[model samples]
Target: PQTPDEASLDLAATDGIRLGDRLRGLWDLRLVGGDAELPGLPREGLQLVLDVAPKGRGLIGYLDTPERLLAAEPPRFRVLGDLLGASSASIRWRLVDQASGSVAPTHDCSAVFDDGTLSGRIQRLERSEDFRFVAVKRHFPLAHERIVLNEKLLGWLVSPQHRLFHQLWHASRDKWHRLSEKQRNALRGVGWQPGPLDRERDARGPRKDRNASGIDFFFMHRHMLHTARSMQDLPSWERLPRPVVPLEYDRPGFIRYFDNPDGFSVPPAWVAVDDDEYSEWLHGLKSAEAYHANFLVWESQYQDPAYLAKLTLGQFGSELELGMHDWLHMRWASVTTDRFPADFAPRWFRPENDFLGDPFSSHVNPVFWSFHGWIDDRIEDWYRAHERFHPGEVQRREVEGIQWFAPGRWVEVGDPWLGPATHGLDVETMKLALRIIFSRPWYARNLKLA
Candidate 1:
């Protein structure tokens, strides 16, 4: 491994900025206690490490400056978590006086593990003769690694297919470069300039593989017509393609088979929910159309069989129509409390375990597959409506086609309802969501309703 200084210098050299230039006047301060809202808490304490001194009356302004923002500080301040997880503590500070000493008084605050965030006020110990006050707030263990992007790569990811795969391709190239360099150095140290191998060359080549040709404009453009023409036109999911290696889930071979049953290949799919609340422009909803929104659950499986049955059979049936107010009653995957009468939290798939330890189980998976079982049941109803079949045939079809994916043995039938707030929704808004889901057409031909 490179020494810390050597690594820093190497990284800086690769970018063309001198290592010292990057370090400049940066200072890391540990903040203690404060009652004021310390806006500067994103970085640690509330003091500025003079890169450019503010002319008179401006140290007050300098005190509020974020590392890169050019604006003067606003009067009202709010501190929020930068990552997906809830926060556990907070710290804020105010700069009191520069003339009195090199040091200024600081303020720190804390909150319960459940409170999520801590914030409040700041008052001067006494009115200063030559100094003024500036306040900043800080939360611990900042979750995101801030990226400072230059003008070049910024525009590339935002561009179209002339360089359509810019993000993926660039990331691949970066990985190859690092590995290739490491291999070369290893060989050179042992008196051999190891020649490039097939693995290295293949990784560096154009990523237009067998599937790449299929992802062209033609496929995207004609998908609407294809869906309308026939359900057969949809992509064929094999008996069970091998699982794509799970990138994030790590529990021995827990993610080994993934959604694929065969463990040989996996289809490409992106499954993310989008609505006015979490989308760009609210994706064009007016403020009046907005409802308080937050993720109701951070990827987890439901342990209650009854709740799972209601979700799959009653709401998401086989027809593939939008799922109505189905998600409005959800339990947080990590929440252990059953405060309400109907609230049901399962013990088998405890908060710490993975997917109830089954490849086919939804007890720990984020996608809620058991709920889809109900939807598959509904699809059977639709199939029966079109093609009358004997009871035996219907049962056999259900056993092979639907129940195979989600075993009926694991299906629960009477779990209590989790309330709206816990579901990350308000009941009134959920009623509206039901209207949208039931009324909207499955394809974009009727997108005017969107």
Candidate 2:
């Protein structure tokens, strides 16, 4: 594993940065006052490491124990910005009876960071002992920081045919050249990358062509999501919660790590939500205000009665993805180059864990599954709202098909609202089937909504 950047947590820019800003990063932990030993812990006293970082509208934390990600509990920033708190259950350490007997294994902890020193307390259940501890800022090993993909998922992602899959949207020549040779070759085979006109309606265009790639954008992704879920092991999975929108006044900022110059997989840094003409428009998607402002309007579309009725699955997907989905995609996947981006070590360019920003290699990064889950859920939102009015409309999506890939030989895709059962979506089945869909007329090439 590569040594992670020592100063990666240096969010403090001296001139304009604040304690709240500097508060997110890694810390080495130790106990100060309590002396009750919890069995089955790190033998050298009870060593702990904590990583506190931004998530949604608030801070999300992690512990360097078997209870990673604080294990399914939603803990928030304890104070305005200084104290980080996480409460976890089932951390399974021993009580009075040594090896055989165990009591309720719960750990509640909060860390307060002043300058770079971390002071915290761990209060465990059924035990009277608690400690006010201090931890200093420290560098972390790579194995401890990254969310590794399962062996099956890693294998599938590295496969030649499956790799370079996201390049269907990424064909930037500037970015195309930055890649190492291995991926440049696999990306070489991904053809029919989209342009703005393919997505916009032309009166002269065939009904089939007007938003063709829009439907491809929707349909192809459904299968991709199915394949992703199939690759994971049954347990050890933690569902990422829905993003929490911050209070209107104190809206959350766009991800900082992704906004750096070396952070982007595509050029020009940020893309405009309103204007597709890249050179003519401006959106500080890197900032907090514009970030949530665009997200607000974009999220409102699926719920709008008129908006839901306006398009078939194809039209709706085309409009939705072109606007907010890409905006969030660009925000979430953008990474600081030395750390977050993933490279083609086996077959992709990576450094930061944020490689999902690059379409060519997005799926390889673990975040892509959850990212698409958000996109795929939008389809259901449209249909869930649509079905009440037109009873058969949802079923029609399977038959005459939703556009782009109306090859007439389509298979049953697991409907999220009904049940996400996979019959033909397995990797082996999809290895051939996805190519068939990819071969469909105008399956790629779109940038604006027609």
Candidate 3:
């Protein structure tokens, strides 16, 4: 029992009609009535598709039609409209062809939400004719469903071993921030320091002098440390950085590493070489050349059976060398300052310069997913090939015990001895345990079992 505005304000809490929620998913469009025949248009059975979704702080939608059979490519259409008001129960929508930026048809309709059916009228723009249509909730197969199913199946097939590796990845990321003084000192000995390059602002941004190299170095260092700890050989821990030197790549090699040096097809004032040089200067510890070499050698070689045959489970390029993750961070932030010939103004790789080039904010760009997806595919390929040949070899390698400073206390986790115990817990039992631990206390207190 809530008013329209209250329900609109907090849609999740009320069982009220919400245009944004109702408009989500695909809708079928057909002409009930209109000026039947327009120039270069079909008179009947024109198939129109509308996709609407809640985006950011408002609702955004798209409209398209498969009727462009004669066109070289599919036409791009954008939906421009707004929910009239909660009290009015009406909607206004306009279908605009994105290429020409012209409105094709306009919809001004009172809507009815009855028995989960949505029907509305689409009035032709600047015309007396109207087109009415009914859109039913579609039940179609989605591509992601198969993708998710495969991932879940893979997860089940590779149990505690995959889980351990996954945990270590997260642990390494967390442990970097908690490096001990001795560890920091050891790393400093190897030319890695916790500060920005001399006379350079932080690679990510201009505000503070942050350690971009240190961040990347720590990621690589902790990963190795975790690997060693997992193996039960309590090696003497040190803060010394791994020995890695910068190497210059040929022009072709450089292009392959960045792939898109022109910054999304728009020519920038600076070239790809300029960005590369600036990145090296910004890092101050290891050269982008070192990272590029590793990317080509380790990540890019997943398809080569000969290379795969040579690698042990622990010897994947990412683990032993500046792997894919570290390479992305280092290459993205490298920057340099050059005086412009016109006015002699300094230009460098600012954090805001490129989305794919900044580690901290890279995830905001859709390209980041595309890049990571490629990386994931490579890793998946490696795993499938290796597991097929090696059998239980991956799970057989036990992780040695490691102490991590978590929250308040140093927790001794990652013990190979605990693997058996972890494996003993069935999936259902694990789910139950998680539910018990994570479910809201109030809900649990008032639990009703049926």
Candidate 4:
């Protein structure tokens, strides 16, 4: 495997800049024209901070405004881009309108660096005028020290075990990348990599074909049976297993046939619920056989009132939650067991071991963490793709119940319900409390009703 330094050098050669290193600190922006000078611009009161780093083979970074706002307020736009050539780089910036949930247009810009200064022209789709801007590198003596201190403080807040587990989880997801020699050896020691015994057993044929001493037996008299208990047309080979069984909700004996040593069994009722919907949506997926299915048809399965009602019970049914995320989950968690035998089986199918399948005991499995990590990555991917199009519904809430709090207290996007300051609540504390409350989906739902 190539060393980290060599890998980074290769990337730098291709991208023309050590992007993660160059974009790591703060930059003072001088927005010359366009809507940049509006009230929403991150200028005057706030500094632009770039937290750029290499995640896997590519770069991941968030452009944060210094002044923290309410959770309902739009976050600092996420920056995603690549160096196009030796001198020019492509940058795409995005933000979501919290009220309407409409994504804004991604500000696609071409940037050039000269000496220690950088200039860029941001162009929106279907617009003639360009938003031009220049940036000067900011020098901070305590930047590195502050970064280390923040990391240490975060580590102190969370347990050591939590930190270590997250590290391992990240490493596992990046197993396809060129990992360090030490990391590979450590993962191997922890049984994350297949062992010699496992490889040997896998190399051998099926267990029935092998002898007690690991010898192959071509011919063996292993089949002989008298009259069976039931009077039915029996096959000539009495030991032959049933070819296939129709997966029924009441009689779900097919699960035992799969090599499921982990006892990871989903409830039969849940399976039945999903199975019925599968028949309904299967045709919509095209031929009920093709791997690439239409997402529109798949998502329609959740439109059923009964299905949504089932979700309200807090059960993580595939059709309910997974369908909204992606169609792959819908197929993987589809009720038709034969279509996804690997998922229903006890063996570690990719989806079965993660939180998506076994929602109750998911937290205990390391796969759960890694699975959600990718899910979050995909969400970020969506944010990047949509650019500035907002994707959230406008949330409004009426305030009542408390004597100290005033009536007609309402919450909306960009303006959160901070309650009353007369109750000894500071702005920062109220903001934090409001953030935690508004971050939940349940809160949003309740606000909609209110």
Candidate 5:
């Protein structure tokens, strides 16, 4: 049972064709401007037409500006009364799944289309603003072996595997210099400071720099929590009981956690019987039965509110990563006693039994959210402790050209990265950045990175 039920989705695709084809032909679309908070645009006289019809297996879609659709996979659309809704995003995972691809359609756009009127608000996942759009049915007219051409574009522009997209993302010349003082500092504080090109700042950096790694761990997962909450269908994590450890459930020796009666289950994508226990763990998650004593030391320190408060966020993150957090992942990762069971079917990633261990499929597991929810709560408590005890005092170890830690300034949790008016960004500064990246001659102007 997938998150978006495959059974019901199949029904939608089958039914959508009959209804969608009715509105086929051409359309005169008018996109109302979005709220000024988060930025995006739509144009007037945008002459466009939807070409949707049954192909070999299901409904295939066509549009000139954007061809790729389907955010999750196997695109779908729904119709209820006069209100018809559809979900669209442009992300293609080829080669080795997530590790090897890039996301072109960075945001999922869900919109409801009125039966005849065809106009409504479009919701971008994780965005604070909803943009309204109206449509006028112009006329039904006529309209890729070109998938090979698509391969050319995908190979160069959005393929992380070949490293083109990534190469662009990491601008060698002055990538660090182009940022405003704040942006540069944020990146520097989070591991870019050794100058952008320094080999010392490469793979070897994260290991020694506990400060940056810890900050990054909390920052990234905190981002995860908000996005999860935004999606209406995800199981509740906020109110559920997030128990500390097991005997608390059923520990001088580190007990298992009380699972809050969470019945939502997720299975491993696949297990490796041919591999050793270490290899299995390397791929996804294996038991932490061996680390109980080590867990005790880590757990004791992290569990104490005073201890958590004493350390900076980086210190807390780094310690937790090695001990408590890492232990929990292995502790709950479901697996049988068979260390070397006969190699079973589906050795690769199977959506049916999506694993909770590997990064590729880990987040798909419901428990990943539950545990991450608890971890996120711990971070909040860290801030609470600081506000109560330290109160507007810089806590991070001082770095030469970086002011990453600003205890005096209270910052929004999800700021500009989370959208709707990037926190603390001056308008003119924003204008300069945007004009340089997106104004006239967008394709021509310098991105500052290169």
Candidate 6:
């Protein structure tokens, strides 16, 4: 026995023909929008709606009616002018089967025009559990293309090969297909439009940098070396003649107050420390993961440690770029006004508002900047050493020359080439170097590297 194709059956007339039997083909539907007295519906507006029919005949398809005529399982039927918004409406529709001599005239649906917000619904006739209805409200505001692009990025991140990607792609494609329709009917409504692909759409482009590739383990070790070299370049690090021994204890030189906060205040003492000592401290502070986290933090929420930690766990678990810094304890700006009672500088930065400072001349501490560059140096060094791994792992690294801004625009440079020996930076030009060290293709090729 051969199963009869759904299109050959006339469910309404045939006694044995089930709803599923006649589920195939076009459905004539009309949208009505206004009040009762005068209905405004366009002529020849019939549309061929579609949907699967359940085993029995219940609500299965969907249609868009005026906002007023809404119902959860509204039946597919004609509307009176009062219920719809337009003065009157009519649609083009037809049903015909070669096997069954079934035919019907196109239905005439109309609506009345209303001033208030309009609402409505449409229904499917042939009902089936498998049939699902989706409302197509034409002339409605569509989402920005960025929304679609974000989805695409999210899709690639979540499940690169999921069918949802294809579905979203199709949705975007369809939206694009309807652009012309939207443009011509600008008065009616708009449809969703997709934006450009986020990631490197170009198949051939420079790869990303080591920091971007999320490779911290290797970058951290390299940063430490930069830190050590910087420490050795301190200006006061020479075999200097003993300062004609401070003549009197009262006249002890600045060196005398090195760690002893007696002669000068705490701030001055800090300024007196040799750059080499700061370099040593910075070397210890450079952690690959921490540095990466800092950048990620800056890009996301401006260096929020909590957010950075969250990003680390959410992004790559424990595989963070390696780098270390004093646990978020420095006032980089003059906003630290409310002075603290105890040795509260460290505590002030600890979120309880403990530290105090003058807002006028506060600046990002040089020590912190040094450590920051150390991280950069290490990341760069890692890339240089691992030539085979560069230029393929990630997207291109954008190199921007050292940008100098006039006063009022305090410059903050976080470069690896700032430490001692000037070897810390490429002294040739203080340009901010952007190196694409991570070869994304290489990374993709060597999953083992991850």
On residues 215-296, what C-alpha lDDT tens digit does candidate 4 reach at each position? 1000000000111102222222111122212212211232222222122221111212334443334222221222233433
lDDT string, candidate 6, 103-202, tens digits: 3312232112120111223223222212111122222111111112233323222231221222222223222333344332331122112222121111
Tens digits of per-residue lDDT, candidate 5, 1-450, equal 648535433333423433444443334556576541213222554423333322111222212111212122311221112213432221111111122154333233233444134654545445446455566654211001101112333222222221211121222111333445565444333333322222211112335233233554555466555645555333434532322332111121111111112332221112334534343343222222333344345545555667776776656665565445644544444442221111113432233232333333345445666667767777666766776777765344222222234333332111112111112123233223322322101111121210
What local lDDT does model 6 show for residue 358?
Answer: 16
**Which portions of model 3 show Cα errors greater than 4 Å?**
1-18, 33-64, 67-78, 86-88, 95-111, 115-117, 125-130, 137-144, 148-450
| Model 1 C-alpha lDDT per residue in residues 1-450, reported as the tens digit of each score | 765544221221211121111211212233345333344344244433212111111111123233322223231222211111212232233443333443434322222221012233344444332222322222111001121222342232222321112112222222333345554344233222211222221122243221111112111112222322242222222221122222123211212222222312111111114432222222211111211122112111122233333332212221122211122112111112122211122442232322211211212222222323332333344334323422222222122111221212211111111111111123223223222222211111112224
Query: lDDT at 134 for candidate 1?
Result: 28
True lDDT of residue 370, candidate 2: 54
Winner by TM-score: 2
Q: How many backbone clashes does candidate 3 have?
A: 13
Supply the TM-score for candidate 6.
0.18
Flag the better candidate by TM-score, 4 or 5.
5
Off by over 4 Å in 4: 1-17, 34-39, 42-46, 55-64, 69-76, 84-100, 126-130, 142-450
- Predicted structure 2, TM vs. truth: 0.44
Q: How many backbone clashes does every candidate have?
A: 32, 20, 13, 11, 5, 64
The CA-based lDDT of model 4 is what? Answer: 0.30
Native-to-model Cα distance after best TM-score fit, residue 239 in candidate 6, in Å: 20
At residue 278, give the lDDT of candidate 3: 39
Q: What TM-score would candidate 4 get against the native?
A: 0.25
Global local distance difference test of model 3: 0.34
